[PDB]
Design a protein around this nucleic acid. Structure first.
Lengths: 263, 346, 210
DNA sequence: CCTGCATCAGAGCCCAAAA
DNA sequence: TATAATGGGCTGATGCAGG
RNA sequence: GGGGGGGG
């Protein structure tokens, strides 16, 4: 078949067809299951050995694999492959953290505490200290992963008009904007069914945006304003250091009813 | 450890398409869209709903979510229900299902194979206020758009069509997200124009142009006033955490007073005014003061004008305007003795 | 914050926790019976992208064929690792070979025609049918096969063997078959009269292979 | 087992500080 | 919405893979 | 990936 009616190849009379000079040869490790009648599985479905493919149950799969329905060759290919669950990112980790029974792990770690080499006992202790920490406190480990990200009230990250009518704003607003963009874009890419390469890039960018918001510079390059080398000031930066909230506004303050002069 | 390098490594794991392969995928995507159109008619369904159902099985169980616009919440129950109706088709109808599936598969491959094009376009747009990866993702969004609109019959290579949509997508991204104070896309375009214009004017004139020199160069509709107003709008805010020079111990925000919350003096003053204000309407009589108090309101602000006062003051309606004048008149006399309220005139 | 709190709970190193969180490596929740490099995939195993792709989507490879060069294997054919696909192409893995883009399609059209021949009698071997390649006759001395009709020659030459068709007006009056061992002495579009030699038949003449 | 060996968070106060 | 364009520019305290 | 002109 071709773009325009001319240049098509139509069979002149009765005959048989042979294919020659292929552009390339694709070697697939797969099983081929030809079918005369209708096929019951459509292409992309995943299939296990013994599962019925086509022709009312006559033809079935010998391997675990992915269905490729060839309407030209009139055959159902099954590419050897598994329904394996393997994930990337904070989504994966949150699940494993959800899937923790701390009671059991305490029991397990106590049994390891009855063991020489000192190091065995040392590491089992450190693990056991985190387990016991969560148990007494009542905190769920999966809480170390964020689903809802909190947004600080605006008057604490103000956008204010200064003297000149110019606007001055706290860096947290830019860190939030980056976050919001990547979140919104990720939702659109998901709804539009982008390939995994694109969604993976977006998801990892989303982690980075959250990371800069909470502690900027902590992991990776510090986020900066355009045309400035100045790292943006994140919440962690606000809390800590000489200029941080504790040593500046909390353990000492500027005060009213005070003055100064030469002695 | 380097997010740019990693992404570059992942794209490089998909080999580029041959003219045949490029045409093949493009062909399969187009045919598949035609297949989904047909399936709506036969089935009595919605092409968008069908498209998402077909697409769900190709990507796998990993991605299943509600898609904006679809009438049904898209969850494994409905997609099993709907998939079973499509697999309930006769052989000549059920073939159209297979076409749609392979279309989605090929769409995926086509997108993945063109990712390196987006990188080469985005790298030229660095430095405009979006990070390289942000530009790649917006550029990728355009690449996705390009695959859905591409008509392979026209015989153009894919790279030719894609490039337009990617440039469009990045430029819209830069215009939409680059400013803390967001600006309409059309207005950002005008602002950029003034820069280009002024840069020419300064390069030919050997000095900075006036507002007037730019306004002539911009043609009709533009005077100096408009050039000035546009630049004001184009001013970007500055960080409160900007060091005031010295860089050791000084922030710009530390020099900005808070004008909103009342100062101790101001709070005191407002309290003192209310206490002297009530201690004055009660010294004629509370009631003709209560009528006046009702007309202005200590807390509330109940000034209409003539109607509403028809109801409950206690009198009918012209009278309250009159007792308003005598309340205010006795108040004025009472004011000259208790002239303490003069100082509140600032 | 080291030792990582998440890391300590899950028995994950610093590097491992990085690789999962920052999308450098997969971690398996449910192997679903996968096995890689001879060992079964166990839960909480870290896979690279390449490992996951081999597990999840299968392993395959595509080999370019130099332009015009035809492959030594046919579409659909099972192939061992190391088998030679094309004069310069060697396959790296076992599996099904698939044609990508055939540049040349050859259609063998089915033709069933009734054609005549004349041979001496002592020289021909009696059979009710002749399979391709079967010996038709053996001539003690060369025999000249002659036209039995007058006409213009329409010559149709096969790979081996030939067909010859005489027509007056446009209506074919005869269809002759020349086996191998029979050399046409006439050329296409040649006028012939009844009795003049069309072909010399020398020695053993047999059915052509096709 | 122990040591190199790496990765991180410390580095005085208040006032002018001339942006 | 269409020539083609396809991979960036100084210290101490502590927890680790390695002799 | 942590830092500077003056007064005490």
């Amino acid at each position: 078949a071709a773009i325009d009616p001319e240049e098509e190849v139509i069979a002149e009379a009765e005959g048989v067809v042979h294919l020659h000079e292929p552009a390339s040869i694709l070697v697939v490790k797969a099983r081929v299951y030809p079918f005369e009648d209708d096929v019951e599985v459509s292409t992309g479905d995943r299939v296990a050995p013994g599962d019925v493919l086509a022709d009312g149950g006559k033809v079935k799969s010998d391997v675990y694999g992915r269905v490729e329905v060839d309407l030209v060759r009139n055959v159902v290919r099954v590419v050897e492959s598994y329904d394996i669950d393997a994930r990337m990112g904070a989504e994966a980790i949150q699940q494993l953290l959800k899937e923790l029974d701390l009671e059991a792990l305490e029991k397990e770690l106590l049994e390891e505490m009855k063991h020489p080499s000192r190091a065995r006992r040392a590491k089992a202790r450190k693990r056991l200290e985190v387990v016991r920490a969560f148990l007494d406190s009542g905190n769920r480990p999966e809480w170390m992963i964020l689903e809802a990200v909190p947004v600080l009230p605006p008057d604490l990250r103000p956008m204010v008009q200064v003297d000149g009518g110019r606007f001055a704003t706290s860096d947290l607003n830019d860190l939030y904007r980056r976050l919001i963009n990547r979140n919104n874009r990720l939702k659109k890419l998901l709804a539009q069914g982008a390939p995994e390469i694109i969604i993976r890039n977006e998801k990892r960018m989303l982690q980075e945006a959250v990371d800069a918001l909470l502690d900027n510079g902590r992991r990776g390059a510090p986020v900066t304003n355009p045309g400035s080398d100045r790292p943006l000031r994140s919440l962690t930066d606000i809390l800590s250091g000489k200029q941080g909230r504790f040593r500046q506004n909390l353990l000492g303050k500027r005060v009213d009813y005070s003055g100064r002069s030469v002695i | 450890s380097d997010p740019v390098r990693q992404y570059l490594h992942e794209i490089g794991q998909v080999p580029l398409l041959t003219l045949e392969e490029e045409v093949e995928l493009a062909r399969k995507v187009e045919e598949g869209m035609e297949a989904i159109k047909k399936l709506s008619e036969i089935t009595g369904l919605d092409p968008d709903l069908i498209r998402e159902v077909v697409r769900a099985k190709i990507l796998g169980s990993a991605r299943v979510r509600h898609i904006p616009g679809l009438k049904e919440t898209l969850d494994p129950k409905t997609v099993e229900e709907i998939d079973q109706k499509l697999k309930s088709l006769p052989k000549e109808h059920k073939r159209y299902l297979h076409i749609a599936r392979e279309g989605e598969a090929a769409r995926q491959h086509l997108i993945e194979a063109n990712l390196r094009l987006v990188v080469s376009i985005a790298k030229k747009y660095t430095g405009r206020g979006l990070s390289f990866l942000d530009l790649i993702q917006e550029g990728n969004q355009g690449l996705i758009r390009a695959v859905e609109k591409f008509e392979y019959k026209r015989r153009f290579k894919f790279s030719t069509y894609a490039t337009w949509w990617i440039r469009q997508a990045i430029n819209r991204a830069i215009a939409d997200q680059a400013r803390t104070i967001r600006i309409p896309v059309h207005m950002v375009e005008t602002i950029n124009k003034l820069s280009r214009t002024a840069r020419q004017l300064q390069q030919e004139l050997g000095r900075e142009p006036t507002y007037e020199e730019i306004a002539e160069a911009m043609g009709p509709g533009w005077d100096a006033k408009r050039v000035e107003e546009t630049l004001k709008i184009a001013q970007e805010p500055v960080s409160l955490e900007t060091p005031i020079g010295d860089e050791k111990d000084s922030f710009y925000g530390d020099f900005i007073p808070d004008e909103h919350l009342p100062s101790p003096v101001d709070a005191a003053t407002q309290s003192l005014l209310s206490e002297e204000l009530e201690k004055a309407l009660s010294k004629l009589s509370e009631r003709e003061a209560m009528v006046l108090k009702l007309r202005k309101g200590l807390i509330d602000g109940r000034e209409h004008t003539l109607e509403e006062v028809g109801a409950f003051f206690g009198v009918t309606r012209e009278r309250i305007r009159q007792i308003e004048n005598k309340a205010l008149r006795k108040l004025k006399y009472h004011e000259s003795r208790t002239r303490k309220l003069r100082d509140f005139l600032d | 914050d080291v030792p990582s709190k998440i890391g300590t709970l899950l028995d994950l190193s610093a590097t491992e926790l990085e690789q999962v969180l920052y999308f450098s490596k997969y971690i398996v929740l449910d192997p679903k019976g996968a096995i890689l490099n001879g060992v079964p995939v166990e839960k909480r195993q870290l896979l690279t992208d390449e490992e996951y792709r081999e597990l999840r989507y299968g392993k395959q490879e595509t080999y370019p064929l130099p332009p015009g060069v035809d492959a030594l294997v046919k579409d659909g054919e099972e192939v061992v690792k190391g088998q030679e696909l094309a004069p310069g192409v060697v396959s790296r893995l076992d599996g099904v070979a698939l044609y990508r883009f055939p540049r040349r399609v050859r259609v063998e059209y089915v033709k069933k025609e009734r054609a005549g021949l004349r041979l001496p009698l002592a020289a021909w071997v009696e059979k009710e049918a002749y399979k391709p390649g079967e010996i038709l006759a053996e001539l003690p001395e060369p025999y000249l096969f002659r036209a039995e009709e007058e006409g213009v020659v329409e010559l149709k030459e096969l790979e081996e063997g030939a067909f010859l068709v005489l027509r007056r007006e446009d209506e074919p009056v005869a269809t002759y078959f020349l086996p191998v061992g029979m050399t046409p002495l006439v050329v296409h579009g040649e006028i012939v009269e009844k009795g003049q030699p069309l072909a010399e038949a020398k020695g053993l003449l047999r059915m052509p292979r096709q």
